[PDB]
Structure formats: structure tokens, C-alpha cells
Write a protein that binds this ligand. Structure first.
Ligand SMILES: OCc1ccccc1O[C@@H]1O[C@H](CO)[C@@H](O)[C@H](O)[C@H]1O
Ligand SMILES: OCc1ccccc1O[C@@H]1O[C@H](CO)[C@@H](O)[C@H](O)[C@H]1O
Lengths: 449, 454
């Protein structure tokens, strides 16, 4: 019941919907945009399901106003979107593409008018391909490229943006992309990943400084998919493994940003293969933030891996406890969100928290002009319940963004996996609000109270 | 009779018109990677991403040939070598792969070619020696058919400017490396390990070659066009039926993937049976384009490929494994020295295919000794040359149309995944000072080559 749920949130609570540039925009060669590492990743056989690419996506570059009208119609207060660096500075470094800035200029103006709050993400994984020439994120220069990019974007949009985040999910851009080979640019090398790790942390810090110089009134944050690490058993071995996993998967980012240091045990094992950490780096990385964003979907269950020569954190996947799974295979276990936030606030000195992503893959389509996606509605009801619990416990939860306004390109899964509150038929580009979306609209429309 | 030097005795075994040359490739020697409109190649990316190249060595400086090319040409001249084989950097000519032509890039090679003409050095240009513009990766690189058309336009652009003076042109150097080593084995840029990607690269590079042949003859019909291939001398571990059949599968996969389309207008049958379903679309005119008649072809040879049958269940075609060397003689990069494998390879190729004239376009050895007392005593490299050149002379005597030979490396340079650690040059380069020092093997090769054309 959406109305009893609404009663559990403070009157000024911020409800939003969220989106990413490469996932929805399409128009990949339009108005001066040059390729991103994801264009290359999609088009090389092997990396992405069906060799699906971002060429058309949801055609949001052309349909952006219709999509803003839809958000307004749903009565959702905030919109979180990302900015395509390949549109703004197509070669990473080099000339600014003013037509690229124009698109986000119109977008933000469109939101301003409609009373929709704007939460921009500067980097949601679409690195300009040209920067790979220098080594991509493995090169320190790429952080300075971002520094210039951040300044350029905020100089134009800073007078109107309600909030900005430098990065979305360093874990993905770092390990999943450079150690595990699953995301662009698809590397599997610890040296490359440790380089990307430090350089993305550094770029974050550069972005905070850049944004505050050109747009000092805009609250600056960082969006992280902190993993809810759960040991497989209560053994000493699994307990210690859970901590190693926490340091590597979360601590690699939270510790430099919020404590100004890398995790000690991780440095002990991996430090010799890290790039140069210069004298000022950790102070730049750990500048104070106005907010932070949590992306949460599913727990990370781990067990000790005793295999000789296993690299830190030396763990392996543990089986799910719940038997409820989404259509992408991810375990549904809401309590893990509670224990995660509790853990983070005990361990770190953190600012206000917004849930910047939470949602579920369920692939049902249209019948009778409707989409009966009850399990997605149940997923939302259950996790929002947890957020309300966290509010009751005294945690500074200020808002919530449902992941995915619409069905879109889902990275290595291509278009086969649907996360949207709004269904998209890729043949016709018709948007159909799903039942979960009608429910979320019903909840969000009562805020501010 | 009275004592005679080995090089003089050797020179007598070659016809008077035999062509001796030295060879280089753009990314290995040029440096100046961000000057005059050049944009990154897949090798700039590959070098700078940790894990791909020794020491993360890159091509930013190399031998600084872009700035020292005239000095290097004067060295060729002093050596009395008739021909120079070099490659042209697509990233300098059309920096985004497609898109605007970079006149400054063309100008460098225009001046280079004029400089060779001025010195009486014959020019053999290679259009593609692995430095694909990075921007083309956006479309899928060699996995995308569009890339063949990008090369086509590039080829036509270069030949329109240079065709009035080039003595010969080759479209590609070593399809095997650009294809399997780069897209299946993950050792060369762009470092993929995927059979679908590799088979796409295979067909589109074969197609690009054909496009390049047509393009070059369209704007420069006088210039002899060829293709440079590292054909592998496949040697079975035994005469067992299992090993003989394995050697044939190996030949089809490693050589036939390229020789059959180019010289027979078809892909190898057994290969197609195993891999055909994962190949890209082959359009109606594709094999006809690929199989245009060539004026010459180039053989790159270094070491044999020894194989035995791999009986492991499900092993991917050609399902082979490594067989042991016959010699314990190896170069500093680890490659078996076995010169007679050059003879049997050439025998085999001329029986199996109808081929034009042959030029040995690469042959040489990795030996890493440096300068002592003003000299480089690289006797084992000299011996490598003396022995392999003996085989080449044997081939001439045996009736094969071997028209020339290019020593691989003019100078020490960037050696792909090995970085600057592996030296292949006839000329030593001290990378701190950029000083060139002709090695003893280089002095020997000069003494041989100086007498030609007789
Ligand atoms: O595979 C990406 C991913 C894995 C684990 C945790 C967060 C993740 O990231 C999120 O995943 C979603 C689903 O593909 C994406 O739509 C979002 O853009 C992304 O931020
Ligand atoms: O690993 C490259 C390679 C392997 C097997 C056959 C030919 C090869 O490529 C050759 O190898 C030489 C040495 O690294 C290079 O200098 C030449 O440019 C190249 O054509």
C-alpha cells in the first residue's frame, strides 16, 4: 500500500528516477560525438550480448522532451542523468564541442521549467575512445583530461544544476572493467586495474575541486555501488575473507575518499604494483563531499579461497540464501541493504545519503496496453521499506532514485535485460509506463508533503 | 685457387640483377607519435595499457626516425644496398581512419620517397604494418567490414600521391599477425581472444587487400603490387597419419586462410567445415576481389612451425600442439634456427599455389649484444644471414623465382610485445643518444650487397 509507505518518509524526502547517457541516448555519431570505449566494446564480437550497441538505444537524444514530460506526468521530483564526455570533448582532450554542451543545456533548462530537480553524473563509463591511446584510466593523464572536462561541464550547467556527482560506480569502471574483463575496455590485469583505481580516485578529487571553483553552490557527491559483503559462514576463515573482500571491493574507494588512505591489508598485498601516489594525491581524493549516492541491488556473498597463490582478497562466491532471483539472476535480499548502510556509517564519516540506484531486472512486455510487472513492484515496496527503516534508525537518508526510468541498453547484457519503470519497444520506441511505474508514480507524487 | 671471403663466394651464387634491400616499419622506428596531425593507433593504446608490452615500452620516441630520416637514408646509401622497404603510417595519413586527409602526413612520405630517389635507393612501400588508427575500433575495427573500405580509401590516397615514384607497393605485411595473433591469441593489438572476431578480421583483411590492389592500380597502374605474408613452414613431428593430417590442418589455418583466397579465390575446405558457421558474411564479389593477380609476393621467414596432433576432445581447428626442435640453436628471443625449413616452405608453396615472383621481405635474427670498442660483434647474426642466404641461393639454383631479399632490420627498434629489449638490426641504436652503429653483420651484408646490380 503506497499510502502507508509514504507516511513512513519525512515530508521533504526526495524521490527520483535515474538514467545513463550511453544506455538511452543513441545518436552516437550525431552533432560531433566521437566514439566511446563502449562503442568499441559493443562492436567487437565477444563482449556484449548479440553485439548489441548504443547506436539507437531509446533514441533519447531526439525524444528527450517527451521523456521529460513523462517524468513530470509521473509527479517524480528529481531526475538523475549522466553527461556524455564523448559529446562534450569528443577526443577526451582537445577542442570543446559546443553543440554537445547545448544538448545538456536544453535538457537542464527543460527540467528547470518543469520543476524537476537535476542530479547530473559527470562520468557513467563512456570514456572517449581516443584516451585509450595514452592508456585510458591506466594513465594519470586521463585524470587531468577529466579535470578539464568537469570544469567545462560545470561552467555551463552550474548555474542551474541541483546536484552533481563526479563518478558513478568506480567498482565497475575499475575492477569489472580492468581486472575481470566484463566491462569496457575489457582488461584482465591487476597492474592496469590498480592504476585505474588510483587514477579514478584522483579524477574524482580533481572533479570536486573543478566543480567548486566554477560552481560553488552546487552540492558535490560521489556515487558508489558499495557491496553488502556477507560471509558464507561464521568461521574465522570466512569472517576474515569477508573483511578482505570489503577492503578490496569497497575500501579501495571509501577509504581514500573518506579516510584519506588506502586499506592497510590491501596495500600490504597489492601496493608494490600500484601506480605512483604523489604527495598531494590522498588529500585531493579526500576532499569533503556534500552528499554521496548508494547503488544497491543484491548482496555480495563470499567465502574464503584457500587456493595457493590466490590474489587478494582471496575469496570466492558463496551461494544465495534467498531463492528469489530477478530475471538477470541476481538474488533478492532486502535486509542486506539495511546491514550495508549500518556498516558504512559505523566505519566511515559520511555525508547525507541518497539511494541513487535500486531496481530489478524483469523482462515482461506489453499486453492490453499494460505491463504487469508485479515482482518489480514487490522489489520496490520491499526495498523502500528498508529505506524507511533506515530513516527511523536515524540515518541521513535524504532521497531515493529508482533505477531505470526506462528499459535500455544494459551493458554486457545488451537489450535483453529490462530494468525500466517504463517499457520501451525498440521497434517503435513507444514508451509504456509499467504497473511498477504507476505504483512508484503514486508514491512519489505526494512529495513534498 | 686461393682463399676467398665467405661473402664473395656467396655473391657468386646470385644472379647479377638480384635485389638486396633492408626493411623497417613505421611504428617500430618513427617516434613523433603526436606531431603533425598524427592520432593514436591501436599500438599506442596496446603499449600504454599495462600487461601487453614488456616494460610498457611504447612508440613515442623509438629510433626518432621521423626526425632523422635523412641520416638513416644516407646510411642505406653508404651501405650500398639497392632497396629500402618501409611502411606508411595510416594514423599520419588519415588520422581517424575515415575522415579528412592529413596533408602533412602525406608530405612526410612524399619527402621520404623523393629522398630515396635522390640517392638511387629503390622504394618498396608497405601500406599496412599493423598501426590501425584507434578511432576505427569504435566500429569494431577489423571485425567490421567498414574498416576494409577505410583501408581502401587510404590506399588510394597514398598511391595517388606516391605512385609516380614508388618502385613497388605491398598492401599488407603479415595478415597472420594482424589476424590470429591480434584477435585470437591476444598477443598483438588489439589483444582480442575470440574466434568470431578473428574470423571477421581474417575475411576483412583479405578483402582490404583486394580493395587495395584495385585502388593502387586505379591511380598508379605502373606500380607492381604485392602482398607480404609470413607463411609458416609447418613441420610434422612424425609421418604418422595423425601428424600428417594435423600438419595439413595447421597449414590451412595458418597459411591457407590467406593463400587460398588470394591465389585460388576460395577458403580452405576443411577449415570452412570447422569454422565456416562463425565467419562473417562473404558477399558475391568478395573472393573475386581478394584473388586479383599480383605482380609479386613477399615472404617473411624466421623459424619453422613444428606441430603434432592434439587429440584432446573438442580441440578447436586446426587441433595441433608443439613438436620439439631438431637443433638447440636459438636466437635471443628464443626462436629455433633451422634454415632448411625455408627451402621446404618455398618448395611447398610453389607446388600448391600459382604464385608470382618472390621477394624475401623479412629475414633476420634477434641477438642483443651491444657496442664494445666502437663495434658490435654479432657473429651469430652474421652466421644466421650467411646460412639463410645460402638457402635463398639454393632456391634460385633450384629454379624458384626468387628475385630479391630484404634483411630484417635495418636497425634495432621497437619489437612489439617485446619492447626495445629484443634487437633485430644490422645497425645498433643506442636509445639514450640515438647513435647508429653499423654492426659486424651489417658490414658483412653491405659487402655482399654492394656488388649488386652486378
Ligand atoms: O553490471 C553492472 C553492475 C553490476 C553489479 C552492480 C552494479 C552494476 O551497475 C549497474 O548495473 C545496472 C545493470 O546492468 C546498470 O543499468 C547500471 O547502469 C549500473 O550502474
Ligand atoms: O611476434 C611477431 C612475429 C611473430 C612471428 C612471425 C612474424 C612476426 O612479426 C615479425 O616479427 C619481428 C620481430 O618481433 C618484427 O620486427 C616484424 O615487424 C614482424 O613482421
Amino acid at each position: 500500500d503506497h499510502k502507508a509507505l509514504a507516511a513512513r518518509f519525512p515530508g521533504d524526502f526526495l524521490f527520483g528516477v535515474a538514467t545513463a547517457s550511453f544506455q538511452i541516448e543513441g545518436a552516437t555519431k550525431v552533432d560531433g560525438r566521437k566514439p566511446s570505449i563502449w562503442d568499441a566494446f559493443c562492436n567487437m564480437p565477444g563482449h556484449v550480448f548479440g553485439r548489441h550497441n548504443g547506436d539507437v538505444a531509446c533514441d533519447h537524444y531526439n525524444r528527450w522532451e517527451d521523456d521529460l514530460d513523462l517524468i513530470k506526468e509521473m509527479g517524480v521530483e528529481a531526475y538523475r542523468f549522466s553527461i556524455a564526455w564523448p559529446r562534450i570533448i569528443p577526443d577526451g582532450f582537445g577542442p570543446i564541442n559546443e553543440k554537445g554542451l547545448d544538448f545538456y543545456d536544453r535538457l537542464v533548462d527543460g527540467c528547470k521549467a518543469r520543476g524537476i530537480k537535476t542530479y547530473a553524473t559527470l562520468y557513467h563509463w563512456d570514456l572517449p575512445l581516443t584516451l585509450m591511446g595514452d592508456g585510458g584510466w591506466a594513465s594519470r593523464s586521463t585524470a587531468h583530461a577529466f579535470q578539464r572536462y568537469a570544469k567545462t561541464v560545470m561552467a555551463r550547467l552550474g548555474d542551474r544544476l541541483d546536484a552533481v556527482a563526479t563518478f558513478n560506480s568506480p567498482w565497475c569502471a575499475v575492477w569489472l572493467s580492468h581486472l575481470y574483463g566484463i566491462h569496457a575496455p575489457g582488461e584482465r590485469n591487476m597492474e592496469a586495474a590498480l592504476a585505474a583505481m588510483h587514477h579514478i580516485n584522483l579524477a574524482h578529487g580533481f572533479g570536486v575541486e573543478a566543480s567548486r571553483h566554477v560552481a560553488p553552490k552546487v552540492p558535490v557527491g560521489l556515487v558508489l555501488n558499495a557491496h553488502s559483503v556477507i560471509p558464507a559462514s561464521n568461521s574465522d576463515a570466512d569472517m576474515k575473507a569477508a573483511e578482505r573482500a570489503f577492503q578490496f571491493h569497497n575500501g579501495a574507494f571509501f577509504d581514500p575518499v573518506f579516510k584519506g588512505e588506502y586499506p592497510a591489508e590491501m596495500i600490504e598485498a597489492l601496493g608494490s604494483r600500484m601506480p605512483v601516489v604523489e604527495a598531494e594525491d590522498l588529500s585531493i581524493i579526500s576532499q569533503k563531499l556534500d552528499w554521496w549516492g548508494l547503488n544497491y541491488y543484491t548482496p555480495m556473498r563470499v567465502a574464503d579461497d584457500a587456493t595457493e597463490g590466490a590474489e587478494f582478497p582471496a575469496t570466492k562466491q558463496a551461494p544465495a540464501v534467498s531463492d528469489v532471483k530477478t530475471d538477470i539472476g541476481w538474488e533478492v535480499y532486502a535486509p542486506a541493504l539495511h546491514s550495508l548502510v549500518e556498516t558504512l556509517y559505523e566505519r566511515y564519516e559520511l555525508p547525507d545519503c541518497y539511494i541513487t540506484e535500486n531496481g530489478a531486472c524483469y523482462n515482461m512486455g506489453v499486453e492490453n496496453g499494460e505491463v504487469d510487472d508485479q515482482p518489480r513492484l514487490d522489489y520496490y515496496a520491499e526495498h523502500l521499506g528498508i529505506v524507511a527503516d533506515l530513516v527511523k534508525d536515524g540515518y541521513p537518508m535524504r532521497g531515493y532514485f529508482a533505477w531505470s526510468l526506462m528499459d535500455n541498453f544494459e551493458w554486457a547484457e545488451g537489450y535483453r535485460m529490462r530494468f525500466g519503470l517504463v517499457h520501451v519497444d525498440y521497434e517503435t520506441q513507444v514508451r509504456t509506463l509499467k504497473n511498477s511505474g504507476k505504483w512508484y508514480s503514486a508514491l512519489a507524487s505526494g512529495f513534498p508533503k
